[PDB]
Amino acid sequence: KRRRWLTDHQQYGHVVSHGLETSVVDLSHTETGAVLTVSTKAYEQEIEAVRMKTNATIKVDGMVYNLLPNSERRVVPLTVQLDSGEKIDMTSEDFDRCELEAF
């Protein structure tokens, strides 16, 4: 069944649906130092605009982040069902760190 313990929901969880593999980048908030993640296919224009050093800062929803030095990865979006009959969206990368119920 390949179930994993999700810490945040204190429950076992199970993979229902796979997305295709998206390239993803990391954006760190300027004020708080917070760290976010973003689909490169959506923000492609602005990201390439920062790669050309022209406008060096990416604004999203009035909160502005700086692109990290590399942080370019290939991840798979997953719909993870919970034992409550619940649904979450989780990255491949994060669901991978989680702890198996049967190994």
């Binding site: 760190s28 908030h29 300027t30 004020e31 130092g33 760290v35 800062t57 502005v64 700086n66």
Partner: protein
Amino acid sequence: KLLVPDVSPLSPTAESLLSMFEKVVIPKLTSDEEDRRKLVSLWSETTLQ
């Protein structure tokens, strides 16, 4: 591991606030000369430190 983790270059707004606090504080925040003088002194001290 001498680096402090999660630190990033300041936004042009937050950065302009540094050249502004040296001037703009004086006319805008308060016009009382005591507070103006003392605040300019505080800014100098803390920038130096």
